[PDB]
Structure 1
Amino acid sequence: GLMQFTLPVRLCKEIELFHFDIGPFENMWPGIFVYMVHRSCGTSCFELEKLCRFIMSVKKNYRRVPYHNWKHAVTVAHCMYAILQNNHTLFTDLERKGLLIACLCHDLDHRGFSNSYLQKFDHPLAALYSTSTMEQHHFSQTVSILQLEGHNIFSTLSSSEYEQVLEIIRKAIIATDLALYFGNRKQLEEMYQTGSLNLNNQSHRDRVIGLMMTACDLCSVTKLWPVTKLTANDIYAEFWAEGDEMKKLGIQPIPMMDRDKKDEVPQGQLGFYNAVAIPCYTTLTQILPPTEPLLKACRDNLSQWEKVIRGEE
């Protein structure tokens, strides 16, 4: 009860900033997450014994893939932490509980392959879940781990609160399917501009939470340039592996996944910042003004990719 987690001074200060990098010391990441839960939610939200057992089971169920790994999980939970801390009063006690856990669990048991590759391979998960294939798997893995003896961190919630938190987590995890992001942001853009956006409307909050999940999931684009640049290497290590596997199935992959077209990465990055990242953080900044530092860091990185094309780096 009276046991806090305490970070070294540099981490204690920088963890509050949107652009914090969680560092290369894996053994500190669990403590960083508990620190964020305690400050974001309270030291009472979860039994520490159960949270620690949940965190370590979640870690064990992430694989050793270049990008969709345990570091990504914690990184995405930190961006959510930064959004929740800068928007103190806008979110219910249940939402703060659910969303950090959603972010930690959102890519559970990822193999480093897209929903497209699962479908073309004819992987069993593609038979079980026809759309948002991996994302339904991630939520399913989350429920499994919550039901391990000693792992139910929500046990002190009432039955209805329990049903509400699992519904927040489910929608939050499904929303990380980038195919669903385009239509979700368009709807939110319309609602904000015609002034119909109403955060007491549950279907509207769902949409806003969905956009928060895209923002946290993509947050490598909101870091210092060297973090952004080095994360992109890991993202392409997965994409090019998938392209290799597409070739093995006798299918030429899209240029994004074809290691033979590395040369065009910078232009692909521009398309992505213009089509996905900038519009995401722009609408997010309109709805939640204190998340502006994410939009500003994203535009800075767009500028860095423009400089790469111009041969200046």
Structure 2
Amino acid sequence: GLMQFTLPVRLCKEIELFHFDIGPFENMWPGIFVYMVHRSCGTSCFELEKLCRFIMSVKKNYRRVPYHNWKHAVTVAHCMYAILQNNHTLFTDLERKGLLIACLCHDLDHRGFSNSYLQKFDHPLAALYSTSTMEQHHFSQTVSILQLEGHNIFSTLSSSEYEQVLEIIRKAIIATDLALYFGNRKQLEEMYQTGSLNLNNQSHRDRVIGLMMTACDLCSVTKLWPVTKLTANDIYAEFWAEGDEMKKLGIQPIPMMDRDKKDEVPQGQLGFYNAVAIPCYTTLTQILPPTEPLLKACRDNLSQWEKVIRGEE
């Protein structure tokens, strides 16, 4: 009850900033996550014994893949922490509780393959979930862990409150399907420009939370250039392996996933920042103005990619 979590001075200061990197020490990440939950939601919201057991089971169900791993989980959760800390008056206690958990669990059991690969392969998960295949599996995995003996971190909540927090987690995890982002951001853009956006309408809150999930999920493009540059090799390692599997199915992969087109990467990153990342952080800054450092850092990395093409690095 009086066992607060503390971080070394550099980490304690740096953790508040959007561009924070959690470092290479796996053992520190559960403590970093707990420190974030206590400052975001309170020392009281979770029973520490049940929380630690939940974290370790979540860790155990992340696989050893180059990008969609346990490190990504904590990175996404930190980004959500930074947003919640800079907009603390906007969210309910249940939302703060639910979103940090949703971020930690959003890629549970990811094997490094896209929904299209699962569909082309004819994987059993594609039969069970027609759309947002992986995302429905990720939420399904989250519910499984919560039902383990001594793992229910929402045990003190009422039946209706528990149903609400689980529904926030479900919608938030489903929102990490990038195919859904395009529509969501288009709809949110119009609501903001026509002044019809109201954060008291629950369906509008859902859409805003969905945008924050995409923003946190892509936050690797909003770090300092050395971090972003190195994390890009990790995502391409997954892309190229998926393309290799596409070729085994007798399908020519898209240039992005073809390891024989490694030279086309800087041009592909420009297309990504222009079509996906910049529009995402732009709309998010309009709806949540303290989230501007994300767009700032994203624009910086776009410029860095332009320098790469121009032979300046």
How high is the TM-score relative to the length of structure 1? 1.00
CA distance in 2, matches of 1:274, 1:207: 22
Deviation at 1:69, TM superposition (A): 0.3
Residues 35-55 of structure 1 show CA distances to partners (whole Å, capped at 9, x for unaligned) of 000000000010000000000
Residues 187-220 of structure 1 show CA distances to partners (whole Å, capped at 9, x for unaligned) of 0000000000000000000000000000000000
CA distance in 2, matches of 1:266, 1:205: 36
- Segments of 5+ residues of structure 2 without an aligned counterpart are none
Match of 1:3 in 2: 3
SS at match of 2:19: coil
SS at match of 2:110: coil
SS at match of 1:88: coil
Deviation at 1:88, TM superposition (A): 1.0
CA distance in 1, matches of 2:111, 2:15: 29
Deviation at 1:99, TM superposition (A): 0.1
Deviation at 1:221, TM superposition (A): 0.5
Residues 230-270 of structure 1 show CA distances to partners (whole Å, capped at 9, x for unaligned) of 00000000000000000011101000100000111001100
Match of 1:105 in 2: 105
Residues 50-72 of structure 1 show CA distances to partners (whole Å, capped at 9, x for unaligned) of 00000000000000000000000
SS at match of 2:89: helix
Deviation at 1:278, TM superposition (A): 0.4
CA distance in 1, matches of 2:233, 2:45: 37
CA distance in 1, matches of 2:205, 2:270: 30
CA distance in 2, matches of 1:254, 1:302: 22
CA distance in 1, matches of 2:246, 2:47: 45
Residues 114-161 of structure 1 show CA distances to partners (whole Å, capped at 9, x for unaligned) of 000000000000000000000000000000000000000000011111
CA distance in 1, matches of 2:94, 2:283: 24
Q: How many residues align?
A: 313
CA distance in 2, matches of 1:18, 1:279: 18
How high is the TM-score relative to the length of structure 2? 1.00
CA distance in 1, matches of 2:6, 2:145: 27
SS at match of 2:17: coil
CA distance in 1, matches of 2:180, 2:262: 27
Q: Does 1:44 align with 2:66?
A: no
CA distance in 2, matches of 1:153, 1:281: 32
Q: Does 1:263 align with 2:263?
A: yes
CA RMSD of aligned residues (A): 0.3
CA distance in 1, matches of 2:277, 2:308: 18
CA distance in 2, matches of 1:88, 1:57: 29
Residues 148-196 of structure 1 show CA distances to partners (whole Å, capped at 9, x for unaligned) of 0000000001111100000000000000000000000000000000000
CA distance in 1, matches of 2:25, 2:220: 18
Matches within 5 A, 1:202-217: 202-217=202-217
Residues 279-299 of structure 1 show CA distances to partners (whole Å, capped at 9, x for unaligned) of 000000000000000000000
CA distance in 1, matches of 2:55, 2:32: 11
CA distance in 1, matches of 2:163, 2:300: 41
CA distance in 1, matches of 2:183, 2:88: 28
Matches within 5 A, 1:139-150: 139-150=139-150
Matches within 5 A, 1:73-84: 73-84=73-84
- Segments of 5+ residues of structure 1 without an aligned counterpart are none
CA distance in 1, matches of 2:16, 2:55: 21
CA distance in 2, matches of 1:114, 1:177: 10
Identity of aligned residues (%): 100
CA distance in 2, matches of 1:190, 1:53: 43
CA distance in 2, matches of 1:161, 1:13: 34
CA distance in 2, matches of 1:43, 1:16: 18
Residues 58-111 of structure 1 show CA distances to partners (whole Å, capped at 9, x for unaligned) of 000000000000000000000000000000100000000000000000000000
SS at match of 1:17: coil
